[PDB]
C-alpha cells in the first residue's frame, strides 16, 4: 500500500546531504521575526505592510486635545514595524490582531566540514573559555567509545528542517510536497529586479490567505467513484504504460 516508512540514520544523513540545494540554511526561527504568519495576520488586520510582505485590502474600511501636535516630542518616528511588534501599545483600535512570538534562544550549532575530526571538538569559532572504591566498579559505559562515525551526522540531523528531522512517517502525496515553499517564505535576496521582488510578495500573499481562511475538515460520508465502477461488469482493469494510457485519453476525448 506504501503508507508508512521508517528509516535508519545513515539513510537519513545521505538523503539530507543529497537534498541540500533545495533546503534552507536556517537552524532557528529568529530569521522570521516580523516575517512569520502572525506578523502577516496582524499586518493585514491593521492595513499596514511589512516592506517585503504582502498587501491586502483593508479589513475595517474632530478637534481634540489628545491628538495635539504642540504636545508631541518627536524623537524618533514610529515605524510600521513597531506597530506590528507591540500592537496594543501603538495602535488605537487593534481588532483581530495576533501577538507574535517574542524570541527564541539562539541555536549555537556548529557545522563540521571535515569528517576526520572527532565529533567532540573545540572549534575555533567558539570563543575560548579562560575512602576506597571496590574493584568491581568502573565508570558507566566504560567499554563504549565516546563517538563513532555516525555521531556528527546524528547530531546534524537534530537541527535539520522537516522531514529530515524524523526517523519515520507516513508517505505523502507527490503533489502535496511543494519543495519551494521555503524559498518564498524568506526575504527576497538583494539586488533582484522589480518583477522578481514583486513575485515574492504575491506568493507570500497566497500563502497568508490559505493560512487565514483554513477551517478544519468536515467529516463527511465518503464515496468512492472508481470502486463503484469496478464493482460493475462494464469496467475491466489492467496495467499499462503511462504514455499508452495518455494517448488513449487523448483519442477518447477527441
Amino acid at each position: 500500500t506504501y503508507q508508512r516508512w521508517q528509516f535508519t540514520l545513515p539513510m537519513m544523513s545521505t538523503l539530507y546531504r543529497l537534498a541540500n540545494q533545495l533546503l534552507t540554511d536556517l537552524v532557528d526561527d529568529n530569521y522570521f521575526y516580523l516575517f512569520d504568519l502572525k506578523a502577516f495576520f496582524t499586518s493585514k488586520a491593521l492595513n499596514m505592510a511589512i516592506p517585503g510582505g504582502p498587501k491586502f485590502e483593508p479589513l475595517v474600511r474632530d478637534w481634540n486635545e489628545f491628538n495635539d501636535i504642540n504636545k508631541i516630542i518627536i524623537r524618533q518616528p514610529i515605524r510600521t514595524e513597531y506597530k506590528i511588534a507591540f500592537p496594543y501599545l501603538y495602535n488605537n483600535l487593534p481588532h483581530h490582531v495576533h501577538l507574535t512570538w517574542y524570541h527564541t534562544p539562539n541555536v549555537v550549532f556548529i557545522k563540521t566540514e571535515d569528517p576526520d575530526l572527532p565529533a567532540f571538538y573545540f572549534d575555533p569559532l567558539i570563543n575560548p573559555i579562560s575512602f576506597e572504591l571496590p574493584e568491581f566498579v568502573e565508570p558507566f559505559l566504560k567499554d563504549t567509545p565516546l563517538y563513532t562515525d555516525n555521531t556528527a551526522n546524528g547530531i546534524a540531523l537534530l537541527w535539520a528542517p522537516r522531514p529530515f528531522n524524523l526517523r519515520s512517517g507516513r508517505t505523502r502525496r507527490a503533489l502535496d510536497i511543494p519543495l519551494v515553499k521555503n524559498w518564498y517564505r524568506e526575504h527576497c535576496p538583494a539586488g533582484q529586479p522589480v518583477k522578481v521582488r514583486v513575485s515574492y510578495q504575491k506568493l507570500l500573499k497566497y500563502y497568508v490567505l490559505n493560512a487565514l481562511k483554513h477551517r478544519p475538515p468536515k467529516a463527511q460520508k465518503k464515496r468512492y467513484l472508481f470502486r463503484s465502477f469496478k464493482a460493475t461488469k462494464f469496467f475491466q482493469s489492467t496495467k499499462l504504460d503511462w504514455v499508452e494510457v495518455g494517448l488513449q485519453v487523448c483519442r477518447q476525448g477527441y
Binding site: 499596514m48 505592510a49 516592506p51 483593508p58 510600521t80
Partner: peptide, 26 residues
C-alpha cells in the same frame, strides 16, 4: 500602507501606487 503614507488599495486609482520619498527636502 507603510509609515502612514500611500493608498490603502491601488485599485480603481488609475495607477500602480508606487511611492518614493521626496528628494528635494532640505
Amino acid at each position: 500602507m507603510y509609515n502612514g503614507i500611500g493608498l490603502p488599495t491601488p485599485r480603481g486609482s488609475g495607477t500602480n501606487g508606487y511611492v518614493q520619498r521626496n528628494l528635494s527636502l532640505v
